[PDB]
Design an enzyme around this catalytic site. Structure first.
Site, PDB file in Angstrom:
ATOM      1  N   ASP A   1      50.101  50.045  31.124  1.00 57.83           N
ATOM      2  CA  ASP A   1      48.753  50.164  30.573  1.00 57.83           C
ATOM      3  C   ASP A   1      48.028  51.380  31.136  1.00 57.83           C
ATOM      4  O   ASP A   1      48.282  51.800  32.265  1.00 57.83           O
ATOM      5  CB  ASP A   1      47.920  48.915  30.881  1.00 57.83           C
ATOM      6  CG  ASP A   1      48.529  47.649  30.317  1.00 57.83           C
ATOM      7  OD1 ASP A   1      49.150  47.713  29.234  1.00 57.83           O
ATOM      8  OD2 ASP A   1      48.367  46.585  30.952  1.00 57.83           O
TER       9      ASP A   1
ATOM     10  N   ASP B   1      38.358  49.228  35.605  1.00 55.86           N
ATOM     11  CA  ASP B   1      39.538  48.565  36.155  1.00 55.86           C
ATOM     12  C   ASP B   1      39.603  48.888  37.638  1.00 55.86           C
ATOM     13  O   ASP B   1      39.850  48.018  38.470  1.00 55.86           O
ATOM     14  CB  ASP B   1      40.813  49.095  35.499  1.00 55.86           C
ATOM     15  CG  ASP B   1      40.972  48.633  34.074  1.00 55.86           C
ATOM     16  OD1 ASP B   1      41.766  49.257  33.343  1.00 55.86           O
ATOM     17  OD2 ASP B   1      40.314  47.645  33.689  1.00 55.86           O
TER      18      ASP B   1
ATOM     19  N   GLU C   1      47.028  43.321  38.953  1.00 59.90           N
ATOM     20  CA  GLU C   1      47.576  43.933  37.757  1.00 59.90           C
ATOM     21  C   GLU C   1      47.491  45.455  37.884  1.00 59.90           C
ATOM     22  O   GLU C   1      48.234  46.182  37.227  1.00 59.90           O
ATOM     23  CB  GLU C   1      46.782  43.475  36.535  1.00 59.90           C
ATOM     24  CG  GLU C   1      47.418  43.815  35.196  1.00 59.90           C
ATOM     25  CD  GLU C   1      46.610  44.811  34.402  1.00 59.90           C
ATOM     26  OE1 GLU C   1      45.369  44.759  34.480  1.00 59.90           O
ATOM     27  OE2 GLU C   1      47.214  45.637  33.690  1.00 59.90           O
ATOM     28  N   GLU C   2      46.592  45.931  38.741  1.00 60.99           N
ATOM     29  CA  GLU C   2      46.410  47.367  38.924  1.00 60.99           C
ATOM     30  C   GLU C   2      47.220  47.987  40.055  1.00 60.99           C
ATOM     31  O   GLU C   2      47.117  49.190  40.305  1.00 60.99           O
ATOM     32  CB  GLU C   2      44.930  47.684  39.140  1.00 60.99           C
ATOM     33  CG  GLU C   2      44.055  47.316  37.965  1.00 60.99           C
ATOM     34  CD  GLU C   2      44.617  47.829  36.655  1.00 60.99           C
ATOM     35  OE1 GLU C   2      44.907  49.042  36.567  1.00 60.99           O
ATOM     36  OE2 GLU C   2      44.766  47.019  35.716  1.00 60.99           O
TER      37      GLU C   2
ATOM     38  N   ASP D   1      43.766  39.542  38.111  1.00 60.88           N
ATOM     39  CA  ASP D   1      43.633  40.526  37.052  1.00 60.88           C
ATOM     40  C   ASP D   1      42.156  40.874  37.212  1.00 60.88           C
ATOM     41  O   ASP D   1      41.292  40.146  36.732  1.00 60.88           O
ATOM     42  CB  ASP D   1      43.907  39.839  35.711  1.00 60.88           C
ATOM     43  CG  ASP D   1      43.854  40.786  34.534  1.00 60.88           C
ATOM     44  OD1 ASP D   1      44.183  40.328  33.416  1.00 60.88           O
ATOM     45  OD2 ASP D   1      43.479  41.963  34.713  1.00 60.88           O
TER      46      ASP D   1
ATOM     47  N   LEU E   1      40.170  43.113  35.854  1.00 60.01           N
ATOM     48  CA  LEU E   1      39.435  43.279  34.611  1.00 60.01           C
ATOM     49  C   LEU E   1      40.393  43.043  33.454  1.00 60.01           C
ATOM     50  O   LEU E   1      41.267  43.872  33.179  1.00 60.01           O
ATOM     51  CB  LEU E   1      38.834  44.685  34.520  1.00 60.01           C
ATOM     52  CG  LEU E   1      37.669  44.830  33.535  1.00 60.01           C
ATOM     53  CD1 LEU E   1      36.525  43.921  33.968  1.00 60.01           C
ATOM     54  CD2 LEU E   1      37.203  46.269  33.490  1.00 60.01           C
ATOM     55  N   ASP E   2      40.240  41.900  32.790  1.00 61.93           N
ATOM     56  CA  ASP E   2      41.090  41.564  31.655  1.00 61.93           C
ATOM     57  C   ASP E   2      40.361  41.865  30.354  1.00 61.93           C
ATOM     58  O   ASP E   2      39.178  41.546  30.207  1.00 61.93           O
ATOM     59  CB  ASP E   2      41.481  40.084  31.684  1.00 61.93           C
ATOM     60  CG  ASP E   2      42.274  39.672  30.453  1.00 61.93           C
ATOM     61  OD1 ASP E   2      43.417  40.142  30.299  1.00 61.93           O
ATOM     62  OD2 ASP E   2      41.754  38.889  29.630  1.00 61.93           O
TER      63      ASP E   2
ATOM     64  N   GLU F   1      47.848  36.392  34.590  1.00 62.87           N
ATOM     65  CA  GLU F   1      47.274  36.162  33.272  1.00 62.87           C
ATOM     66  C   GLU F   1      47.706  34.783  32.775  1.00 62.87           C
ATOM     67  O   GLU F   1      46.879  33.883  32.628  1.00 62.87           O
ATOM     68  CB  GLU F   1      47.697  37.262  32.288  1.00 62.87           C
ATOM     69  CG  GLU F   1      46.745  38.449  32.280  1.00 62.87           C
ATOM     70  CD  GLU F   1      47.253  39.630  31.467  1.00 62.87           C
ATOM     71  OE1 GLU F   1      46.435  40.517  31.146  1.00 62.87           O
ATOM     72  OE2 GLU F   1      48.463  39.687  31.162  1.00 62.87           O
TER      73      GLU F   1
HETATM   74  O1  LIG Z   1      46.134  44.306  21.368  1.00 62.20           O
HETATM   75  P1  LIG Z   1      46.983  43.076  21.639  1.00 62.20           P
HETATM   76  O2  LIG Z   1      48.476  43.366  21.562  1.00 62.20           O
HETATM   77  O3  LIG Z   1      46.567  41.883  20.796  1.00 62.20           O
HETATM   78  O4  LIG Z   1      46.742  42.667  23.197  1.00 62.20           O
HETATM   79  C1  LIG Z   1      45.615  41.858  23.573  1.00 62.20           C
HETATM   80  C2  LIG Z   1      45.824  41.420  25.004  1.00 62.20           C
HETATM   81  O5  LIG Z   1      45.811  42.581  25.875  1.00 62.20           O
HETATM   82  C3  LIG Z   1      45.225  42.240  27.118  1.00 62.20           C
HETATM   83  O6  LIG Z   1      44.126  43.116  27.284  1.00 62.20           O
HETATM   84  C4  LIG Z   1      46.248  42.483  28.214  1.00 62.20           C
HETATM   85  O7  LIG Z   1      46.650  43.846  28.251  1.00 62.20           O
HETATM   86  C5  LIG Z   1      44.767  40.779  27.032  1.00 62.20           C
HETATM   87  O8  LIG Z   1      43.523  40.583  27.676  1.00 62.20           O
HETATM   88  C6  LIG Z   1      44.721  40.519  25.530  1.00 62.20           C
HETATM   89  O9  LIG Z   1      45.042  39.157  25.262  1.00 62.20           O
HETATM   90 ZN   LIG Z   2      44.538  41.048  31.692  1.00 58.86          ZN
HETATM   91 ZN   LIG Z   3      43.583  43.939  33.710  1.00 61.03          ZN
HETATM   92 ZN   LIG Z   4      46.000  46.301  31.749  1.00 60.07          ZN
END
Ligand SMILES: O=P(O)(O)OC[C@H]1O[C@](O)(CO)[C@@H](O)[C@@H]1O
Ligand SMILES: [Zn+2]
Ligand SMILES: [Zn+2]
Ligand SMILES: [Zn+2]
Ligand SMILES: Nc1ncnc2c1ncn2[C@@H]1O[C@H](COP(=O)(O)O)[C@@H](O)[C@H]1O
Ligand SMILES: Nc1ncnc2c1ncn2[C@@H]1O[C@H](COP(=O)(O)O)[C@@H](O)[C@H]1O
Ligand SMILES: Nc1ncnc2c1ncn2[C@@H]1O[C@H](COP(=O)(O)O)[C@@H](O)[C@H]1O
Ligand SMILES: Nc1ncnc2c1ncn2[C@@H]1O[C@H](COP(=O)(O)O)[C@@H](O)[C@H]1O
Ligand SMILES: O=P(O)(O)OC[C@H]1O[C@](O)(CO)[C@@H](O)[C@@H]1O
Ligand SMILES: O=P(O)(O)OC[C@H]1O[C@](O)(CO)[C@@H](O)[C@@H]1O
Ligand SMILES: O=P(O)(O)OC[C@H]1O[C@](O)(CO)[C@@H](O)[C@@H]1O
Ligand SMILES: [Zn+2]
Ligand SMILES: [Zn+2]
Ligand SMILES: [Zn+2]
Ligand SMILES: [Zn+2]
Ligand SMILES: [Zn+2]
Ligand SMILES: [Zn+2]
Ligand SMILES: [Zn+2]
Ligand SMILES: [Zn+2]
Ligand SMILES: [Zn+2]
Lengths: 328, 328, 328, 328
Positions: D59, D65, D88-89, D109, D111-112, D271
């Site tokens: 990512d 983040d 995650e970072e 995580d 910042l999700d 996650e």
């Molecule tokens: O764009 P996509 O493939 O639906 O991914 C969404 C997912 O990506 C994330 O940001 C994780 O990278 C989650 O928080 C979220 O559920």
């Molecule tokens: Zn996340």
């Molecule tokens: Zn994250």
């Molecule tokens: Zn990420």
């Protein structure tokens, strides 16, 4: 970078406590934040004005007094760490129900600086915490301990910024409230008052009623015999504000007896004792002019006492004047 | 329910203004909110302490002084309503670039109550607005107008709550800042000072240096000839706080000349004039003891002046004492 | 460094307005801040839940809906700039009393994203401002103007941060609310939507009810004929949130007709028109699939309309599909 | 009326803990408040945009983040309750210095919802807490425990309001942040997910890549065989937001494997596991479609896993489809 929450917990884990003291302190912090938020917008919430009642000491109760009192009482009862509460706003001591009882006794002044509320001058909250001494059922008698028995004391100051000053056996520490995250941050560790200041704080409106010692001292502050520059005068009118300035700037704060207040105006349990404790832990002194405030054994939860506190050299000079006149 | 933003705009639409005055006021409100937020958490942001410079008046500059000064200046320059700015923190008047020039002249005290910053006592911001009188290029001379020429004056008080007091030809109004929505709310409309108060405010530390009139008056406040109860004393130490209390509680505030300050300590352009204007619009008085503060034509943007202000009956009594001694 | 208050005023002084438009915008900003503060703590204030009533469109009214509606209405009535108000929460248009009448007509959605309130997903406020066209007494008919007649339109988004997006003839601008000082700050000037995006937004739960065009388009987004990567799907469920993402990320947002909503679900006056205006001012498109949303002349203040909006190339592709099937 | 601070402490005193778990939770709360404040004004602080680095998962790292990651790490290190941290970072697990070591392992995580940051859609913070199992020096291996071993798990949701959801053996509880006093208040106690919902959440943009089971299920949600009304679709795009809605509204959330993400996109340690734990404690289910998420023993701190979670009847229906196709 050190929050009061962490400070109190880390201090509790080191003292190996059951956890009720820590929770008692956590509860006060929450109450202080709630009071501060209300204070910063009181006028808008129409919290300025009288409540319609008069307390034992004879003061006219204000709306913010009621709100603050309610907050402190409610937060202390749910802390499950107190058994007896003494408030400046309550005629008698409050006995916590058995279910929510703890072993700590708390004496507090929910909102100090009543006369300064409406003009937006600094006000605050003062507290003193004792450990239950008796073995019998908790009663008002449990709050009748000399200040020297305090386990913790301090005050919240709602000034240009909100500060929580906490004193315990280890010393005095100052935490500032960061309104954005609702956390008190340590900004002054192990505070020590200056040995001698250059500010005297007292309501000189009572000049005609001052005893000879106070009169002589003030004359000395205005007309120094050593020809040095006179002390500056400061009197905010709110004990918490004047005392806090005395702590960080040094100097002396005085509220001696006068005609209307033969034994002083300030209350021993929730005004004088907490501040005397903070002062002594900071290396300062607190005397009635005849005895140490913390050594007085109270016989009334609302008794008053004259008080002189601040830098040791300044308080000592006044004490010497009192001694001189006593041997006269 | 009435916000300052609405108040100022509604007041501007009624006066049929081009809009720069309204915007000038809007800019000050924004600066005041920014300053208030910084003040309520100054210690945490390490804003307590000296900046490392000394202004013309001789005061030691503080960090909050710099921040507040920077905020006011920047917000006023982008208001496109000012042409000349006079600040307590700047040696010379600030001339706004032609591009951002407006016809208003602003004299301000970015942070008043310097000595009270570190002890968390109330501090504030004071301002006075004039309309450019000259026809030639804007210069420092444009700020040298007597207070009577003010179009608007007021102050922000960063006390237990933040208040913005604004005075104009129509009168004085008080707005409290609601921190939650960032709006000042009208809480006191068309404020009028009490005809007579019961509080005198002055630094008695300079007693050895007071002129005979001040000395006689204070003696009268402590030992009333009519045997009435003495006036209470209050001296926060921050002009904005002491003056605001004087406005809402009544009484008298005094900062006369002394040895170190032969012409008084307070500055005419951004301390005395703004407060004198607020006082007179509220039905109060403001005198040096010999002449009306608002009638003085300044010759120095940083000149000082003795000042006595507050309830008309109290100020008048002191004036009578000055007159009596002048005919002596 | 540019506040919305300054932006709106500076924009008003340049347009030489009487000042009621500026005040109208100022009032909305204040209402938006009040709503945002309430929203960020709704659960604590027990603002989650139904109010006990159903609006004309048939939606179940929520408590926050009532609060937001009350705030917008009250702030608009005291702006002295409106004469007719149309709210999603009111059966009929609101006619402002003569005393407080202005020449602007406001159509608004006090709280958009009802179904997302309780789960804390983004919600917002949408508005559209028209100038009174008729000469006779203000009535509901004055709000029945095509979107192309809007003078200003926008929305407040209460998401991870609160944003106020304002569109006018000059373009679209985004201002973020700084909770500390209660000011919206310009963060995105003269916003322009991407020509083509990579995200499609629609509730596919209604798949069995979609017309052939929508069905074909979605199939194309999942199975691209040019073998490119499929579009990602996003559907927050709150029009304001999905539309804002469409504006800043590009792509397409769709709410076509279905069995339960034969003419679409979204309301023309306070949902579709305001967003269509923002979209077109940003270089995007907004169509029902058969005609431009802004060209529809309403006959009911609460009529609904299908809507497809976003990046021009994406909306155009869908339009071509509709055209293809119409000539079939 | 019950704060998280009191909740956590009261819960700690009942469990008779040394106090590091309580402090660990206190630290997370403080970090969450700091992150929330930053998030509500990110655009103004210029926190939107890339940081200039790519994490192990691939990512693109954002500025928020980094800030959030820094806050969580720093607050956890000073909690004196952790020994191993997995973010995650961060490429590798973080081993806390002996001096500040505690017995808890934290996977988080910071910042999700990365892709939703710039469009102001809901984002959050996710965490899972384990107790050190090994006896040897703390290492990355200590974070490689199956989710079933969690002692505590939860998430902060920065949506219309900020919510902290905490799950432990006793159940799931929701606390809302009151921005005014900086305290999380209990608003939903012992939360239980509905047995069956009416919303399915998934990115259908990957339709061409879904396995036969997911494909069949979605078809069933749009074209119900029992002729009931189709499920509504919702996909915020931020796992924390979609999962929280699933918890309080019921329904199903899905992120199955696809071409680019053969083993799913979401990460197991910080996650999937935390959310699976919250779901199961609320009476919901969490499966990869072939096995319980909490039973997977990780071999990589950053391994991914497909995940299906939510109401038991909905997840079970999908599981039955997977079973049916496996026996095909
Ligand atoms: O764009 P996509 O493939 O639906 O991914 C969404 C997912 O990506 C994330 O940001 C994780 O990278 C989650 O928080 C979220 O559920
Ligand atoms: Zn996340
Ligand atoms: Zn994250
Ligand atoms: Zn990420
Ligand atoms: N957080 C703390 N900070 C300082 N001293 C504490 C703390 N917690 C407990 N103590 C000390 O330990 C004693 C017993 O604590 P407790 O078991 O909580 O009543 C208290 O009376 C204090 O002297
Ligand atoms: N908002 C306002 N409130 C009060 N008086 C105003 C206001 N705006 C303008 N005025 C008055 O109208 C004059 C001209 O305004 P302006 O054209 O903005 O410079 C000012 O000098 C004031 O006397
Ligand atoms: N603050 C403003 N920003 C943008 N356009 C404005 C503003 N104020 C006025 N206008 C324009 O000028 C017209 C007349 O303004 P008013 O006299 O206030 O009704 C409005 O209908 C707008 O087209
Ligand atoms: N505040 C708390 N809330 C819930 N459980 C707790 C708490 N504190 C401790 N525990 C439980 O007691 C165990 C030991 O706590 P500690 O001694 O702080 O590591 C933890 O692993 C939890 O299972
Ligand atoms: O007006 P006086 O007599 O100086 O009293 C001031 C004192 O009153 C108090 O408000 C107590 O009533 C103190 O906070 C303050 O020190
Ligand atoms: O310490 P002193 O001489 O009483 O001065 C107090 C005055 O100083 C000021 O800070 C100005 O320097 C005023 O705000 C206040 O009235
Ligand atoms: O649940 P549905 O049919 O997708 O409706 C979602 C729409 O409902 C609304 O809340 C209007 O009622 C819009 O904000 C949103 O676009
Ligand atoms: Zn009292
Ligand atoms: Zn008191
Ligand atoms: Zn009191
Ligand atoms: Zn100065
Ligand atoms: Zn000053
Ligand atoms: Zn100054
Ligand atoms: Zn609705
Ligand atoms: Zn809506
Ligand atoms: Zn609505």
């Amino acid at each position: 970078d050190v929050t009061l929450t962490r400070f109190v917990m880390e201090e509790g884990r080191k003292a190996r406590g059951t956890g009720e003291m820590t929770q008692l302190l956590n509860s006060l912090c929450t109450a202080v934040k709630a009071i501060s938020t209300a204070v910063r917008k009181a006028g808008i919430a129409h919290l300025y004005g009288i409540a319609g009642s008069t307390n034992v000491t004879g003061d006219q109760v204000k709306k913010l007094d009621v709100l603050s009192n309610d907050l402190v009482i409610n937060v202390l009862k749910s802390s499950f760490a107190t058994c007896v509460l003494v408030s400046e706003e309550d005629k008698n001591a409050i006995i916590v129900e058995p279910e929510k009882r703890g072993k700590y006794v708390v004496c507090f002044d929910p909102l100090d600086g009543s006369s300064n509320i409406d003009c937006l001058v600094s006000i605050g909250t003062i507290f003193g915490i004792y450990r239950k001494n008796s073995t019998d059922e908790p009663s008002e008698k449990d709050a009748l301990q000399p200040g020297r028995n305090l386990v913790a004391a301090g005050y919240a100051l709602y000034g240009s910024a909100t500060m929580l000053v906490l004193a315990m056996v280890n010393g005095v520490n100052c935490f500032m409230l960061d309104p954005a995250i609702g956390e008190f941050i340590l900004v002054d560790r192990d505070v020590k008052i200056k040995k001698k200041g250059s500010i005297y704080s007292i309501n000189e409106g009572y000049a005609k009623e001052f005893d000879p010692a106070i009169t002589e001292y003030i004359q000395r502050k205005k007309f120094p015999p050593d020809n040095s520059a006179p002390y500056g005068a400061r009197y905010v009118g709110s004990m918490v504000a004047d005392v806090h300035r005395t702590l960080v700037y040094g100097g002396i704060f005085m509220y001696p007896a006068n005609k209307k207040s033969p034994k002083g105006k300030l209350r021993l349990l929730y005004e004088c004792n907490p501040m005397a404790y903070v002062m002594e832990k900071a290396g300062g002194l607190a005397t009635t002019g005849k005895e140490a405030v913390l050594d007085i054994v109270p016989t009334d939860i609302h008794q008053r006492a004259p008080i002189i506190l601040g830098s040791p050299e300044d308080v000592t000079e006044l004490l010497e004047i009192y001694q001189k006149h006593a041997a006269k």
